[PDB]
Amino acid sequence: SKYGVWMLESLVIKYCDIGGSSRGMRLFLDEALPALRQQNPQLGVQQVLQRFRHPKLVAVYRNGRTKPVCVKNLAPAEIMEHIGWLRNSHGRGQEYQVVRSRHLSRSPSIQGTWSVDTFASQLERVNEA
RNA sequence: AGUCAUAGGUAGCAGAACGUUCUGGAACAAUUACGCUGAAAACAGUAACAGAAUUGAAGCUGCUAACAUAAGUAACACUAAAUGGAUAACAUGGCCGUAAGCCCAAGGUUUUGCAUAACAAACAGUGAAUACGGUU
Ligand SMILES: [Mg+2]
Ligand SMILES: [Mg+2]
Ligand SMILES: [Mg+2]
Ligand SMILES: [Mg+2]
Ligand SMILES: [Mg+2]
Ligand SMILES: [Mg+2]
Ligand SMILES: [Mg+2]
Ligand SMILES: [Mg+2]
Secondary structure, eight states: OBTTBOOEEEEEEEEOSSOGGGHHHHHIIIIIHHHHHHHOTTOOEEEEEOTTSOOEEEEEETTSOEEEEEOTTOOHHHHHHHHHHHHTSOOOOTTOOOOTTSOOOSOOOTTOOOOSSTTHHHHHHHHHO
């Protein structure tokens, strides 16, 4: 969530009726998705059905970004931790990695950055001796 | 789901998995896929459970095919010699002349003739009549 706004506007879930890779996804829809819907009231969860394709998990973000994740052969615990990563993020991918100082700010230097002029008056008295 | 303990490795040994082709379980792509990302890796994004393997390739001066490099480089020097706005019929000059001329043999087997581009090989051509060579 950025500035209080939740940033994950919609989640799209695609599955299969007969496919064996969608056993965990059908179990997740049947027993675990009402808890996800109750715990996340800002979310919008769609339910699309693809009768011959592997289960997918498409996350739609409020900055216009979209990220498709495939969840074939996954238990409902692994699907829930995938949605935990999708919900708690802004959607940046595998390639982004953030600034290495781990710090980012407008206005770093209160009192002004050190320059050539900050301690000019003291250094001439230092050179006086 | 909180604390601890362990995690360098060649040869070797052990354990867990990914992927390719085919088959059984009635049929998992007629009208495709395409939010561009996910995962520790092999990878994934058109089942799953089992099974059968000509099942995984930068690495054998391996084989096959294609494409580069050297490189527009080397070569286009055995000879008589060419010129006139043409590989000219005409003119000028030169070279061989016991050959670079003429007639045959062996061998080749149509390589032989025709169009100031062309639509032309699809068309022509080898005649024993001097007691020519053979066949005897
Ligand atoms: Mg070790
Ligand atoms: Mg150690
Ligand atoms: Mg079958
Ligand atoms: Mg399928
Ligand atoms: Mg083999
Ligand atoms: Mg040249
Ligand atoms: Mg001439
Ligand atoms: Mg002859």
